Design a protein around this ligand. Structure first.
Ligand SMILES: OC[C@H]1O[C@@H](O[C@H]2[C@H](O)[C@@H](O)[C@H](O)O[C@@H]2CO)[C@H](O)[C@@H](O)[C@@H]1O
Ligand SMILES: [Ca+2]
Ligand SMILES: [Ca+2]
Ligand SMILES: [Ca+2]
Length: 195
């Protein structure tokens, strides 16, 4: 299915901008296995970028495994041109950041990826910017996926949570991503914001 993304320009600092409160939480509900770990994320776009704000409830944080996706982490997938190819094109993106803000790319220039995290009681927050290369406009559709890796005290991934793909294959297959449609940018810009 499809998430409608509002226009707006958050500050990347791991803090919840006022403007995030005007936008709805998306709840990923596709669990590989049962787990106490849950998550929610909000999206926003501006002329230059896509923005993700993710909160994970996860009582045990682990990143001791040297395999990135075997650490408690979130992953963001983007099919920017909306090709929906069955294998990764050169505009496809697959990014990951752990609760300590350690970033990895599986596909795409990591110079486009800017993140902050914050430890919360019972979990963590990720706040992420992805620089877009196609100038987005109202009505732009992109393919998107969101994933949480849940690791336990044995230093190994024990579960995944996905928004859209239930088949383990988003890392290989962009056609599996869901859809985001960008809306809400004014046609006139601003004028004089009066004092
Ligand atoms: O199914 C094993 C497969 O995993 C690839 O790792 C994936 C991971 O399974 C997935 O959940 C996450 O989205 O992305 C990584 C992409 O690295 C692994 O790299 C393959 O060698 C392996 O066959
Ligand atoms: Ca912020
Ligand atoms: Ca693509
Ligand atoms: Ca965990």
């Amino acid at each position: 299915k499809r998430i409608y993304v509002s226009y707006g320009s958050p500050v990347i600092d791991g803090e919840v901008d006022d403007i995030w409160n005007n936008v709805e939480w998306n709840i990923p509900r596709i669990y590989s296995a049962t787990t106490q770990t849950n998550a929610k994320f909000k999206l926003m776009w501006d002329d230059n970028a896509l923005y993700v704000l993710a909160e994970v409830y996860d009582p045990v944080l682990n990143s001791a495994n040297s395999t990135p996706y075997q650490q408690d982490s979130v992953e963001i997938f983007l099919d920017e041109n909306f090709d929906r190819a069955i294998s990764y094109q050169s505009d496809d993106l697959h990014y990951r950041v752990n609760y300590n803000n350690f970033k990895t790319t599986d596909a795409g220039d990591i110079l486009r990826f800017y993140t902050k995290t914050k430890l919360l009681p019972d979990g963590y927050r990720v706040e992420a910017r992805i620089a877009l290369s196609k100038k987005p406009i109202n009505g732009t559709i992109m393919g998107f996926e969101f994933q949480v890796n849940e690791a336990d005290s044995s230093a190994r991934r024990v579960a995944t949570i996905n928004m859209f793909d239930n088949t383990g294959n988003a890392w290989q297959n962009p056609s599996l991503f869901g859809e985001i449609k960008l809306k809400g940018r004014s046609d006139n810009a601003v004028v004089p914001i009066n004092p």
